Design a protein around this nucleic acid. Structure first.
Ligand SMILES: Nc1ncnc2c1ncn2[C@H]1C[C@H](O)[C@@H](COP(=O)(O)OP(=O)(O)OP(=O)(O)O)O1
Ligand SMILES: [Ca+2]
Ligand SMILES: [Ca+2]
Ligand SMILES: [Ca+2]
Length: 341
DNA sequence: TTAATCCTTCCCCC
DNA sequence: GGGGGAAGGATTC
């Protein structure tokens, strides 16, 4: 096994500089304006000009403007980026059938055959890096290692616009010196629970009796960390499948009044069906994000497909189920369609 | 402070 | 006991 991971640099922000180079060299911040008040919303992402100064992903637009009041702030255009990704996702296909598109900007390539070792592999990196830079004018970072997890870690270490190879020897000094919080699939909450167990390095998972671990962070997540620890992790590069689509919208003012919410709910359903594109779900779920930012949801599965008229009808009833079941106020509302026929 | 998949209960019933 | 499918909360990105 030899995995080659590609992960695009400051993607949205970069795609924006690609569509107006004049931006190149200036702090660019890509926002998601909630429109609940002048400059309300957060930062989807920003290029490095803006990051060394603090402006990172997730901070309020307002807070970001206090730091870099004179940086280009642009409204996110997912679609445009979504299309740019697709094109880049093809150049990559041409480099290996066994390909796994992990997200809008990540893809794992199994070049086990194509290449015969890390020398030739690392060269295929530059070859791929360079080709994407030429065809679409985008810089990316390449990680290469024994398995996907490490191939991804390799990338995290080489960015921005870089390439790195993690060889079995390094894999080992990592299975020992890598910070458990930097292991893919281990978010904050799990990284925390693993702290109270004394597990600070991938290795520590070997000293704890499975059941205690299986009881603290779920079974699968447990067996997963172990294999990574005993260098036995080796999952295949499979072409993932969209198992559910949905959209959510923030409202102008929080609310409880049904009629007051419906219009939004529907706006969500409209957008959601359009995305489906020929797909037909058997499952629908209404998702409400309350004023205290906690999430609540309710849904129903049908023994057949859902037509738009059905979605409308059934979603309103499920929203009523939420409002009833919850006394707080609703800050956001959306729907999710899944279980596609 | 702006999408999707995983994990653990339920509940039906051989 | 345990397959098998639903539902909803919990996490990760
Ligand atoms: N709060 C947020 N709101 C919206 N999008 C977000 C938020 N936080 C993160 N994102 C998105 C922003 C990006 O589009 C996507 C992350 O891109 P990501 O792959 O993690 O790194 P990147 O490689 O493109 O950035 P970097 O320059 O650090 O390498 O996550
Ligand atoms: Ca990326
Ligand atoms: Ca991390
Ligand atoms: Ca990502």
């Amino acid at each position: 096994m030899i995995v080659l991971f590609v992960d695009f640099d400051y993607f949205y922000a970069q795609v924006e500089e690609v569509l107006n180079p004049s931006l190149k060299g200036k702090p660019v911040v890509v926002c998601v304006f909630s429109g609940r008040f002048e400059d309300s919303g957060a930062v989807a992402t920003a290029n490095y000009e803006a990051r060394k100064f603090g402006v990172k992903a997730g901070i309020p637009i307002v807070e970001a403007k206090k730091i870099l009041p004179n940086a280009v702030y642009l409204p996110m255009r997912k679609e445009v980026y979504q299309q740019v990704s697709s094109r880049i996702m093809n150049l990559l296909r041409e480099y290996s059938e066994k390909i796994e598109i992990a997200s809008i900007d990540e893809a794992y390539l199994d070049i086990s055959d194509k290449v015969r070792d890390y020398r030739e592999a690392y060269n295929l990196g530059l070859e791929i890096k360079n080709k994407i830079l030429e065809k679409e004018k985008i810089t990316v970072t390449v990680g290469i290692s024994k398995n996907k997890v490490f191939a991804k870690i390799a990338a995290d270490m080489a960015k921005p616009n870089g390439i790195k190879v993690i060889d079995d020897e390094e894999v080992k000094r990592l299975i020992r010196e890598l910070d458990i919080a930097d292991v893919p699939g281990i978010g904050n909450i799990t990284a925390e629970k693993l702290k109270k167990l004394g597990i600070n390095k991938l290795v520590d998972t070997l000293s704890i009796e499975f059941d205690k671990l299986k009881g603290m962070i779920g079974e699968a997540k447990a067996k997963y960390l172990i294999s990574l620890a005993r260098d036995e992790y080796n999952e295949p590069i499979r072409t993932r499948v969209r198992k559910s689509i949905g959209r959510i919208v923030t409202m102008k003012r929080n609310s409880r009044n049904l009629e007051e919410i419906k219009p939004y709910l529907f706006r969500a359903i409209e957008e959601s069906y359009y995305k489906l594109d020929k797909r037909i779900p058997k499952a629908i779920h209404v998702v409400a994000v309350t004023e205290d930012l906690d999430i609540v949801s309710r849904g129903r599965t049908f023994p057949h497909g859902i037509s738009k008229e059905t979605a409308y009808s059934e979603s309103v009833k499920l929203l009523q189920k939420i409002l009833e079941e919850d006394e707080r106020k609703i800050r956001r509302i959306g729907v999710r369609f899944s279980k596609f026929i």
